Design a protein around this ligand. Structure first.
Ligand SMILES: Cc1cc2nc3c(=O)[nH]c(=O)nc-3n(C[C@H](O)[C@H](O)[C@H](O)COP(=O)(O)O)c2cc1C
Length: 163
């Protein structure tokens, strides 16, 4: 209920991921950003932002438009978790960068869930700050076989940060 998990998708991967996190974290509400509003968004104090990476490393359409109506002040009082989707093989130099764009404003609040870069193969990605991943990264086009465990470990790590 209280944990707002906002996602945006084109194919459906993100939606499916958001759903898997909800079940694994519990006490959560999945919300498609394409229908979300600023008012609804601020109704939560804890949020998990799952966003797929569009061409060039930019945000999926739904997300870019929703994010544009948000300022840093809106993230200030929240605890935030970022989950990005990407294709590390086809896009070695833009791997899951969408998240980074959300990060530009989300850094105003309390961000948690930074992940190690071990187990990935790519060239560049703004999503990496301090030799670490700004949040959880998922690859459904190349590493679908590692998702279920990654979400599990992530939920474990960040679990305590949410309540
Ligand atoms: C037009 C297009 C552009 C993409 N650009 C990138 C990119 O720049 N970096 C990346 O890591 N993945 C990129 N991808 C792969 C997606 O991030 C990945 O497949 C994701 O799972 C898509 O999520 P969705 O099914 O929820 O829309 C792109 C996919 C498409 C169709």
């Amino acid at each position: 209920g209280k944990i707002g998990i906002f996602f945006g998708t084109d194919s459906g991967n993100a939606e499916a991921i958001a759903e898997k996190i909800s079940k694994a974290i519990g006490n959560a509400e999945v919300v498609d950003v394409a229908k979300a509003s600023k008012e609804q968004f601020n109704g939560f104090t804890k949020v998990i932002l799952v966003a797929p990476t569009a061409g060039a490393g930019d945000l999926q359409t739904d997300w870019e438009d929703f994010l544009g109506t948000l300022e840093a002040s809106d993230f200030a009082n929240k605890t935030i978790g970022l989950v990005g989707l990407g294709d590390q093989d086809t896009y070695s130099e833009t791997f899951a960068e969408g998240i980074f764009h959300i990060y530009e404003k989300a850094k105003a609040g309390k961000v948690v869930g930074q992940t190690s870069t071990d187990g990935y193969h790519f060239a560049a990605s703004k999503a990496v700050e301090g030799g670490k991943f700004v949040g959880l990264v998922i690859d459904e086009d190349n590493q679908d076989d590692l998702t279920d465990e990654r979400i599990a470990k992530w939920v474990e790590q960040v679990r305590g940060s949410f309540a």
